[PDB]
């Protein structure tokens, strides 16, 4: 069986923003599964589901669908969630959505590994997601940091390096657009442009011809932000290297 | 009642009469998975063979399985009369047959073809994709193909 | 049920049937498509002959049989006048189709 | 927190849907208080009525 909570500790906190997938409607409201915190059952009492009277229940809330929510009453003993949908402020909603997305992404990461090798899920959770969270706040932030520069994976060890490699691969060449508008109208201008390209493309990406004045090259990114540094270099080359030819070039 | 624990002798998931026979279903009910084989008649076959029904699917030794197969494919010799088998009387030989696995369907297909050739009502209905055995299509059969 | 069920529809009873015999043409009487359904019993209806006309509802159908837009209709033309003419019999959609198939009316308009 | 009061007299039955009883609750801990309480369901005289609510009271139900 697959279980275990999204965050570090077992039980939710007061005034925690959650996203709730609707299961079934009863009397109090709905016995929803909180997708920001484990799968513990809770309810939205019929007073705090919407800001205004909307009469219809199965169009603004909907069975099977997700709702932007906040946790009101929590009892750290066994398992009760008194929940609200109304108390979520304007804006804020977007943030909540983002958080939910992040959580989902995190969840997606932690299952492939399990599939590849069974072994207790709690242990896996401990060795992948929690220490980072403790250090900062959320696991997605940690993941982002890792992607930017690999150091968070060095902190707590994965069960195998293969998994890490796979993750890296998943994260990974990324195409970045680079458009060159050369102000040429001469017969031997195209050739010149080509020559210029050949001195800049070498030593490291994919140059596409659209027109005689317009040239569109796609630059590869290995670690996402590595593509910006190559683009910059290319730009520099246009201003510094291409001066001997005397061909006027413009960048979008 | 069996106190016998049994060591590594029974191999689950068996390939018997081409169609895959699954694991730990109760011999009779393990045989039922094969087309043409059905509950009561499977039980009868087992009885004829003289194997105890209260056993595992993997438990069965090869000889027993062979015997069972023989009973199934050649039914008439082992005291199984008319109110017993699949194609009683039959249209092609006069002898009755207990058709199995990949035979019954073929027979059905053949019958359908013959009907089509000879343009009979049932055949026509089958060709159409309609209900045959006394049904009012005012409500019946809205699932389609 | 006729139009909208009602408390006040059970004091009427309509008798014609969907399986009724189709009515043919007469002298001073021909077929029209309805151009636009006008007010106060008046109706603009283009004839199959080739004249524009002004059609008018005359009794009978005034409450019994409701009509819509673009319908094939029996119009008995005025023998003394010409511009004002009167609707006699409404044709069903099936009926219209049958007529079209026959070729009794000229094939110019669709149901 | 736990409180309990005995009922003594019923102040009729009120509710849009109805059914819900208006009761006069007397506390067995100090009989000086006789409060108007909302009670859901079949209730007579001389019954111990547990109250999670301590002080809040309402009369009519609309």
């Amino acid at each position: 069986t697959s279980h275990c909570r999204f965050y570090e500790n077992k039980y939710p906190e007061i005034d925690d923003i959650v996203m709730v997938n609707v299961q079934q409607i009863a009397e109090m409201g709905a016995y929803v599964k909180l997708l920001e915190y484990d799968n513990i059952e809770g309810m939205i009492l019929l007073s705090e589901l919407s800001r205004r009277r909307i009469r219809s229940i199965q169009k603004l809330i909907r069975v099977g669908k997700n709702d932007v929510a906040v946790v009101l009453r929590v009892d750290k003993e066994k398992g009760y969630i008194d929940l609200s949908k109304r108390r979520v402020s304007s804006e804020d909603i977007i943030k909540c959505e983002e958080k939910y997305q992040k959580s989902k992404t995190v969840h997606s990461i932690l299952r492939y590994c399990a599939e590849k090798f069974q072994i207790p899920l709690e242990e896996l959770y401990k060795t992948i997601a929690w220490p980072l969270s403790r250090k900062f706040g959320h696991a997605y932030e940690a993941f982002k940091l890792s992607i930017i520069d690999e150091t968070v994976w060095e902190g707590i060890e994965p069960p195998s390096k293969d998994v890490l490699d796979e993750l890296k691969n998943y994260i990974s060449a990324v195409k970045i657009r680079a458009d060159v508008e050369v102000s040429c109208f001469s017969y031997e201008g195209i050739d010149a442009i080509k020559d210029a390209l050949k001195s800049a493309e070498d030593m490291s990406v994919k140059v596409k011809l659209v027109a005689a004045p317009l040239y569109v090259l796609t630059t590869q990114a290995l670690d996402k932000q590595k593509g910006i540094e190559q683009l910059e270099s290319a730009i520099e080359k246009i201003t510094e290297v291409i001066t001997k030819y005397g061909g006027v070039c413009n960048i979008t | 009642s069996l106190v016998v624990q049994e060591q590594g002798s029974f191999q689950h998931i068996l390939r018997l009469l081409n169609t895959n026979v699954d694991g730990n279903i109760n011999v009779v009910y393990a045989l039922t998975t094969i087309r043409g084989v059905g509950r009561r008649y499977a039980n009868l076959v087992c009885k004829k063979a003289d194997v105890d029904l209260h056993k595992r699917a993997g438990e069965l030794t090869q000889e027993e399985l062979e015997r069972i197969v023989q009973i199934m494919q050649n039914p008439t010799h082992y005291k199984i009369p008319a109110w017993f088998l699949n194609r009683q009387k039959d249209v092609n030989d006069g002898k009755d047959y207990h058709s199995l696995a990949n035979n019954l369907e073929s027979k059905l297909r053949d019958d359908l073809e013959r009907l089509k050739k000879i343009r009979s009502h049932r055949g026509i209905r089958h060709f159409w994709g309609l209900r045959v055995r006394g049904q009012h299509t005012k409500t019946t059969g809205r699932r389609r193909a | 049920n006729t139009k909208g069920g009602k408390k006040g529809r059970r004091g009427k009873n309509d008798s014609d049937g969907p399986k009724r015999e189709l009515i043919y043409k007469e002298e001073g009487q021909e077929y029209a498509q309805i151009t636009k359904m006008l007010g106060n019993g008046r109706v603009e209806a283009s004839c199959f002959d080739g004249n524009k006309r002004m059609a008018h509802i005359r009794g009978k159908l005034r409450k019994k049989v409701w009509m819509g837009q673009g319908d094939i209709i029996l119009v008995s033309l005025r023998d003394f006048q010409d511009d004002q003419c009167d609707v006699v019999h409404k044709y069903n959609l099936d009926e219209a189709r049958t007529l079209k198939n026959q070729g009794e009316l000229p094939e110019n308009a669709k149901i | 927190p736990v409180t309990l009061a005995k009922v003594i007299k019923v102040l009729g039955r009120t509710g849009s849907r109805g059914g819900v009883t208006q009761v006069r609750v007397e506390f067995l801990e100090d009989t000086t208080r006789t409060i108007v309480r909302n009670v859901k369901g079949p209730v007579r005289e001389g019954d111990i009525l547990v109250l999670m609510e301590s002080e809040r009271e309402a009369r009519r139900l609309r």
């Binding site: - | 009642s1 069996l2 016998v4 624990q5 049994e6 060591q7 730990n24 | - | -």
Partner: protein
Amino acid sequence: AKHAVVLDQDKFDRIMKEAPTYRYVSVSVLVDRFKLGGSLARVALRHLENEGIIKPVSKHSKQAIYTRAT
């Protein structure tokens, strides 16, 4: 249940050592605490009850009520 309809020797041993300490012994209980799932559990229970091991409370079939000796 993922099969688990085997009167395995190891399984039998486990049953022997796990039926005490716990007061209640049933097929359902066995299924819950991960050993045998279904029909052969009953058989096992029956063959544990020859002389001693687990004492009966039930005088009824379908549901088994059994307590280990204290």
